[PDB]
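Title: [Solved] Mg-chelatase subunit ChlH 3D structure

Original question kept below for reference.
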Amino acid sequence: MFTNVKSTIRRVDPEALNGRQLLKVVYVVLESQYQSALSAAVRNINRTNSSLAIQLTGYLIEELRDPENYANFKHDVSEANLFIASLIFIEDLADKVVEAVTPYRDNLDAAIVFPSMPQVMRLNKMGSFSMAQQDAMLKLLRTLPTVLKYLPVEKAQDARNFMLSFQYWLGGSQENLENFLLMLTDKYVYPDLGLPDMGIWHPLSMQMFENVKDYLEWYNQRPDISEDLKDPLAPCIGLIMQRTHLVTGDDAHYVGMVQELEAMGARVICVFSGGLDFSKPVNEYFWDPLPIVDAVVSLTGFALVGRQDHPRAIESLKKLNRPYMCALPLVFQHPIQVALQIAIPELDGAIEPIILAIALQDRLEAIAQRAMKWANLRKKPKLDKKVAITVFSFPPDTAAYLDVFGSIYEVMKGLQGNGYDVQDLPGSAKELMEAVIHDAQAQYNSPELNIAHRMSVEQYERLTPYSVRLEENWGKPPGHLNSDGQNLLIYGKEFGNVFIGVQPTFGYEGDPMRLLFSRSASPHHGFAAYYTYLNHIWKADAVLHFGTHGSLKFPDNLIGTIPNLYYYAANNPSEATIAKRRGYASTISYLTPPAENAGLYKGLQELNELIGSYQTLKDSGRGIQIVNTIMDQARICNLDQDVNLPDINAEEMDQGQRDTIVGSVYRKLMEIESRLLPCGLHVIGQPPSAEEAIATLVNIASLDREDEGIWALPTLIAESIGRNMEEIYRNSDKGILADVELLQDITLATRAAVAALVQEQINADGRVSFVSKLNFFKIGKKAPWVKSLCDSGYPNVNEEKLKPLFEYLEFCLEQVCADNEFGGLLQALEGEYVLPGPGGDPIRNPNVLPTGKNIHALDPQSIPTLAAVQSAKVVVDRLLERQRAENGGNYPETIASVLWGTDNIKTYGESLAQIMWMVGAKPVPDALGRVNKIELVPLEELGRPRIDVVVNCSGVFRDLFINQMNLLDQAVKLAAEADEPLEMNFVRKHALEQAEEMGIGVREAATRIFSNASGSYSSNVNLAVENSSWEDESELQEMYLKRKSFAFNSDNPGMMDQNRDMFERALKTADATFQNLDSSEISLTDVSHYFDSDPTKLISTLRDDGKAPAAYIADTTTANAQVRTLSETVRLDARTKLLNPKWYEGMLSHGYEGVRELSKRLVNTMGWSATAGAVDNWVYEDANSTFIKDEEMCKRLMDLNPNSFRRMVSTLLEVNGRGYWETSDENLERLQELYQEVEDRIEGV
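Solution (posted by the thread starter after getting help):
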């Protein structure tokens, strides 16, 4: 009494209620410090708060004897919102408190019982949280963060709110207990009411920290943690989060993240910021001068900086030089929202440790474990570090233009040479392939994969907990795949701390020795075993993959917790993004082989020489019989499918139309001659020479660039002779000799001038920074490139415009020739930050150079650009022009189109803006420049009817650009609804006819934007053609109609439901199929995805009239946009790739893996015969002539790669077997024998 102030007052009531809500609180407590502290808190709220008043009644625990007191208590509990109890530790009364409260348990908005006898504690209740889910106080407080992970997010925030309320109580201050009461009033009584710039946070500290020293001083004083965590050697992880969630106190998932990491022995620094520039905290708090963090995990779901500012973000993350991981808040707490949001951190070079009832546990452990393995990598000593390198399709029957064993060998050397422990490194790439595939070339025995390990069912089942799930499709372990009968086989070879493994077939087509009835595919035990070995037996610290390998299309335990590092081609941002999101991929880019012009050969070179003779023989006199030879030759080269070659003598023509015969054939030969494509494979970290870069530099020099302030060289040359390049291109297309010649002359000039810059920089051999900035005028010389232009016959080219062009070209030459590819992997393995960069076409966007960067796509709202929209109007006018010219002059009513992510990333949304312009819509950018809106154009501006569309969206396009599918659907439906003449609006005309037949609205009948079901990709036509697993085309057409018939809906974007009835009806109306070519290197025969999505023959089946649609492929890779027919483009492929000696002599120069490339293009050619019949007989004929009939070659290919040869031979038999190739019975007997020869070498007898 004399030493502790007690109050006679038990009850506090507000003087005046006014317009304010009343909260009723009842406490029972032993400490009269806590009675009087509550009274003061309640009393201060009552006198300040303008919307809340509190009534407080309470008894010291003892006072509950005299039933006078116990009687009111009971009545007070009855009326009470909040119940509070603390330090009840007497049986007698405890049990009375239970009787009193238990009745009203559900009445009470919340009941809070702080450290007191067990009976009382069970009364605890705060939303969906009970006991089910001073030192005494600390003990229970510190345990609460551990519980959060095993609860769903809302049940967790209740438990966090409980923990937060215990922190305020143990705190015990007046404002502590005010906040206590206001928090509970806000979150569990009256929701509709109530409510430092940056710093460091910890759930278990009451105050924030404004510096690192104050934090670590507090951290090291923490009694509740192991000495292990205070140690500066301890792995430390940085978290970034939004201040808002700490104020709100909606932080349960953040608290669980800190607890998960601390449980794994990681020191944590959680920074926050009320701003949007998170570089500031990173730069202040993750440093002291050195980094004090081993990896960062962003939980903001935002860009580091910001407009969002990726350059400063990068410079900040590169100074830190640690792995930057990102976990979207949405992961914890919907389709358009995740696609738009996840794309941003990817441009900061983020890694995604979260793949894209359920408790936080799986997500929290995932992020933690994967962050902890990034740190281990930073800390484990080089000589102890184990790297596994996985390889797929060996033997083959992936990774574009890659010498896989070529590249692995360079990586292994680089790794040994940098201090990693590499044993028994072979003397050559070949010997290294030989160590993994015994007798790959089938010289002496059949090819046999090296067995690195035999896993016992016992070892498999113990280290593969999820093996049980595989039993449904694959039976008991070890099953029929990667099996000796007893054991699961791990194919690979140990080379010290580097392991080369061969991953098997994922087995999407299931065990052909098992009858199954499930629609839920899983990997086979062998596939599982392989990853089980890497992770839990061999215990890799990191794993390196090449391109897509086998998975990321057909779940977190296969990938594991160790860094997944991918080498992806710089030109495949789309599929690299898919790996980032499905695979926990960190993706280092490599360059595709330095491209060469395809050039002319045999028949085509003879034809070019005849054309050379023409201008002579015209002045000689006999300018006639040559045009009959030129035509007779063209007919032999099958150019008569590409140029109109009438059956008329040159005698029976005017000079005008004889010149045109030549002009037409010429511009088609120069198309072939000049096609810029790779002719071989790439080895990681073997960049091209300056000589090797020149063709790549010519096409870089051959595009106008507004954003760089510079012009194409051809543009400048044309302007020099008062001409425009758009004219010269169109007159070229028409086959006007003078202009076909002028284009070739301008092309040759452009080649010479750029070669002159590369020549100079070479024979300056480092003396000068940039030869392009040397002041030649000052010493009275022209630059070597200006000289070249003058010699080429163009002496008036504008030198003020040349200067910044040729400065740009010299910069591009540096990036094409740079060697960073190995450096990238090194940074990753050292646990550092790999510079992010744009994937794309290096010629169209040279910012894709140099390689060795962590390539990303782009902001899905950044496309289409105004430039892309203009470029689209050209390609649509040209498709319609040509489709008319081949059909009376009649516009088509419906164009069936495919959209890919890959081509849209590269052109900033051209192919996408084509479909917009077909229906006569335009995308509308907001102030900031984001494309989130779309309008129709008036028919005046369209100049023609609205063309109806079916738009087949690839699973990838859906995954990256579902926002853009939303815009397309809005556009189509507006068009169907537009008050316009049916004959001016084929969208409306078809939709009205359909709305009646189907008994639905015009709008619902305007459904045209389809894709795969979410989490599905391709029509599976690619699998069937790849495995010959189909009887008649109908099977292909059926699985298309099953899989690609899921309709996007802008008025309910979540629900993307199958609607095959609408799909069949819209396709029935199709007059033309359409796709855009990605690139010369990813053309129709280089991959299977193009033909996999080809609806051409499907349309001919669906149509009442059975008529096949006209098939077009747009090509916007050069300045000179073409809309070719599918046949034209497949033929172009054949002439520049499969049947081009430069191309097959290029690929075969790399040996075994060379043959694989030939096999690929043949097999993709087959596909086109199955989906479109777009393969002319001579393509198959010439292929058999080049590779089979020539017995010298035939032997070379079989010896080089039995597996890839058996493949080539099977294809040729097959296309004959299915009616697509007609050929000599002798030709089929040769093939039928050669199959049996190689069959024997590969399998036995």
